[PDB]
Amino acid sequence: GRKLELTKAEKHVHNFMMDTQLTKRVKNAAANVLRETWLIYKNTKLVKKIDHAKVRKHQRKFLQAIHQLRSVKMEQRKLNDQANTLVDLAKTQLEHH
Amino acid sequence: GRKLELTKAEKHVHNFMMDTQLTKRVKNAAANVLRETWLIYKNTKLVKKIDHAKVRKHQRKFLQAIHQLRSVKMEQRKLNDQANTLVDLAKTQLEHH
Amino acid sequence: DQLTEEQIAEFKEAFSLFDKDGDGTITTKELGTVMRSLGQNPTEAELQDMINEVDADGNGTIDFPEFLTMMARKMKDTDSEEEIREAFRVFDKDGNGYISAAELRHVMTNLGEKLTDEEVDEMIREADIDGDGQVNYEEFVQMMTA
Amino acid sequence: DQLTEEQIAEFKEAFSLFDKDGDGTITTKELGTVMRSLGQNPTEAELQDMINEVDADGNGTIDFPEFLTMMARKMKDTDSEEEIREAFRVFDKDGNGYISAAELRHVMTNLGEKLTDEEVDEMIREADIDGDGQVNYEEFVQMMTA
Numbered sequence: 001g002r003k004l005e006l007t008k009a010e011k012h013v014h015n016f017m018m019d020t021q022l023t024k025r026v027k028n029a030a031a032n033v034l035r036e037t038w039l040i041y042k043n044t045k046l047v048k049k050i051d052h053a054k055v056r057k058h059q060r061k062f063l064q065a066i067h068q069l070r071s072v073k074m075e076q077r078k079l080n081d082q083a084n085t086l087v088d089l090a091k092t093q094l095e096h097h
Numbered sequence: 098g099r100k101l102e103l104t105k106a107e108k109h110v111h112n113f114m115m116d117t118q119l120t121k122r123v124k125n126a127a128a129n130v131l132r133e134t135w136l137i138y139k140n141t142k143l144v145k146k147i148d149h150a151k152v153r154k155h156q157r158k159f160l161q162a163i164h165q166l167r168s169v170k171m172e173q174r175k176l177n178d179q180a181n182t183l184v185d186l187a188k189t190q191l192e193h194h
Numbered sequence: 195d196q197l198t199e200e201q202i203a204e205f206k207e208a209f210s211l212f213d214k215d216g217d218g219t220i221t222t223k224e225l226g227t228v229m230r231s232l233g234q235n236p237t238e239a240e241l242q243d244m245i246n247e248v249d250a251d252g253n254g255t256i257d258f259p260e261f262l263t264m265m266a267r268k269m270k271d272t273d274s275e276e277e278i279r280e281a282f283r284v285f286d287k288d289g290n291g292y293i294s295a296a297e298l299r300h301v302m303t304n305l306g307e308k309l310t311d312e313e314v315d316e317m318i319r320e321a322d323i324d325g326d327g328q329v330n331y332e333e334f335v336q337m338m339t340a
Numbered sequence: 341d342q343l344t345e346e347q348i349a350e351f352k353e354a355f356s357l358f359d360k361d362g363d364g365t366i367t368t369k370e371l372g373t374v375m376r377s378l379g380q381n382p383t384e385a386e387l388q389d390m391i392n393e394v395d396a397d398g399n400g401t402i403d404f405p406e407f408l409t410m411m412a413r414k415m416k417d418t419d420s421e422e423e424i425r426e427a428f429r430v431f432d433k434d435g436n437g438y439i440s441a442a443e444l445r446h447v448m449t450n451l452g453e454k455l456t457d458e459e460v461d462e463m464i465r466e467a468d469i470d471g472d473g474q475v476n477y478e479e480f481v482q483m484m485t486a
């Protein structure tokens with residue numbers, strides 16, 4: 001039988017999307033990663049004159065967007081393991097007779 | 098300056114323990130992983146006579162313990178990133194002047 | 195992602211573990227009860243997400259064929275050796291790859307659901323391969339997962 | 341895990357981002373406000389865990405020297421190239437490593453906090469290295485993180 005094996009986890013977590021909330025969270029946060037990556041790059045590399053108040057501002061917005069994406073990814077992993085728990089429970093009935 | 102870098106994450110998540118609840122969750126779940134691993138092994142490999150009702154029972158308890166440990170590990174990763182968010186925010190003040 | 199007939203009848207039995215009232219449908223409320231009985235604590239939103247990802251007819255509950263799409267996409271299993279080893283490592287106080295027979299008995303008779311001292315006798319007989327009163331849990335777990 | 345004097349005064353400024361009322365201490369309530377202002381949603385227990393892990397005197401709040409033990413254990417940073425690339429990949433509809441200049445402008449002028457069309461003009465000037473109206477976002481991100 002299955003003995004000590006358990007449902008194999010999805011390697012990367014691109015799922016449970018169209019949970020509109022998580023999906024909307026991703027698009028907005030990802031757009032903001034692009035926004036702040038660009039603005040930090042510009043303000044540290046494409047100016048004659050580095051405005052540090054500007055860099056700090058965009059660093060705050062950059063870290064918040066990056067960490068929002070991490071939050072979604074972690075929640076996806078958690079949802080996936082919750083689902084795998086249910087599949088594992090159902091698979092116990094495969095142990096017969 | 099720090100530009101686009103962020104606080105480096107702890108590689109493995111053995112922390113935020115002595116949150117007694119998480120720590121107690123770990124000891125009990127881990128003991129149960131040992132318990133059910135043993136009982137499944139015994140009932141599938143050390144008997145003349147496989148009792149499938151027994152195997153199913155211990156498979157249910159095994160999956161629940163394994164998934165409880167996963168749950169703690171995921172929560173540790175989440176707590177760690179929350180803390181790293183705070184550190185990242187504080188590090189924006191290192192961008193001067 | 196295909197399913198033999200054999201594991202349809204057995205998954206029918208599986209359905210009744212979830213369909214608590216037996217009304218033929220699984221709700222977020224039933225899923226909550228089941229998940230908590232397994233020592234987890236999904237939020238309302240997480241329960242709804244679980245129902246939704248396999249909610250074909252969009253009626254907010256899971257039927258049988260929706261219950262099967264969840265399986266078909268996940269019949270693949272994998273060995274648990276590493277995770278089991280990590281569970282033993284929780285009790286490896288000195289991080290040296292060993293847990294003494296005495297400490298294993300102490301763990302198993304006090305923590306979690308527990309084993310009788312007689313059940314522990316049998317576990318240690320198998321676990322202490324070298325008869326040195328020490329359990330190399332990596333080797334023990336490898337034996338059990340072979 | 342040592343801290344120059346230089347980054348003490350700057351971390352003092354950092355403390356006021358957290359100590360909202362300025363009473364000289366950070367509570368779970370203040371941490372909650374700050375974390376939510378950053379788009380996260382820690383639970384009460386998670387806030388308490390954050391306070392507790394650096395709670396030396398065990399008085400339930402974080403002072404300045406406790407605030408520094410949190411840093412000292414984590415001053416190490418690491419490059420974000422991969423994570424930034426993954427954020428661009430969200431908008432790579434065909435999974436081909438490219439986002440067109442037109443689609444990038446559409447994303448940046450409609451989603452999140454947004455850029456002006458003039459700011460987008462500058463971003464695309466830099467991003468479209470080959471002048472082909474297409475952005476190889478892996479290369480663009482590598483340029484920006486160099």
Ligand SMILES: O=C1Nc2c(ccc(Cl)c2Cl)/C1=N\O
Pocket residue numbers: 083084086087212220225243244245247248256261264265268
């Ligand atoms: O996303 C899922 N939700 C599920 C699954 C499997 C079984 C059950 Cl009952 C539910 Cl509610 C899922 N896939 O494994």
Ligand SMILES: O=C1Nc2c(ccc(Cl)c2Cl)/C1=N\O
Pocket residue numbers: 180181183184358366371389390391393394402407410411414
């Ligand atoms: O565990 C932590 N809790 C923290 C940390 C850093 C800053 C703050 Cl305000 C808090 Cl509440 C921590 N370490 O980075």
Ligand SMILES: [Ca+2]
Pocket residue numbers: 212213214215216217218219220221224
């Ligand atoms: Ca029902």
Ligand SMILES: [Ca+2]
Pocket residue numbers: 248249250251252253254255256257260
């Ligand atoms: Ca449905």
Ligand SMILES: [Ca+2]
Pocket residue numbers: 358359360361362363364365366367370
């Ligand atoms: Ca305060």
Ligand SMILES: [Ca+2]
Pocket residue numbers: 394395396397398399400401402403406
């Ligand atoms: Ca304190």
